[PDB]
Design a protein around this ligand. Structure first.
Ligand SMILES: c1cc(C2CCNCC2)n[nH]1
Length: 167
């Protein structure tokens, strides 16, 4: 048993809810929250901007030190940093950004990072301002992630479309 509430079960391991991931993280304090990161860990907008704002910019301060030491992530890659006030850990995962012309085949590689963690609270990778089709992102998630993933979908309209179109 875990503390996640109100989720619809899609598969053995994947769960979904219409929720603000920031508010969900604050309530649950999961072991791992996933950030929709870019390779520079510049948390300006989308899910990353919202998570970073909720940490009072401490996520960005930690991230800048990480980049100064290690250099940028790979598209499809990840790093584990603090979860600050939201979670124990934040898994910063870089899905391909269609609005920058990145290979959508890298979305599967991105989701493979989730398999290193037994339970995660996550957004749909490459959705929102990253420009991918969220229906596609959910299919790749279900067909790639084997650990237990709790997906938060901010937009109620999109949530209902994801559920009603799910195969
Ligand atoms: C040597 C050092 C590492 C670090 C692992 C923790 N954070 C990123 C770099 N990998 N290989």
């Amino acid at each position: 048993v875990n503390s996640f509430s109100g989720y619809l079960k899609l598969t053995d391991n994947v769960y979904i809810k219409n929720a603000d991931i920031v508010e969900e993280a604050k309530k649950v304090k999961p072991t791992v929250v996933v950030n929709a990161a870019n390779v520079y860990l510049k948390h300006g907008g989308g899910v990353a901007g919202a998570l970073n704002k909720a940490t009072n910019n401490a996520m960005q301060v930690e991230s800048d030190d990480y980049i100064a030491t290690n250099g940028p992530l790979k598209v499809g890659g990840s790093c584990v940093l603090s979860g600050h006030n939201l979670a124990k850990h934040c898994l910063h995962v870089v899905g391909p950004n269609v609005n920058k012309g990145e290979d959508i085949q890298l979305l599967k590689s991105a989701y493979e990072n989730f398999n290193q963690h037994e339970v995660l609270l996550a957004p749909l990778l490459s959705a929102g301002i990253f420009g991918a089709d969220p229906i596609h992102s959910l299919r790749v998630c279900v067909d790639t992630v084997r650990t237990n993933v709790y997906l938060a979908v901010f937009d109620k309209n999109l949530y209902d479309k994801l559920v009603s179109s799910f195969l």
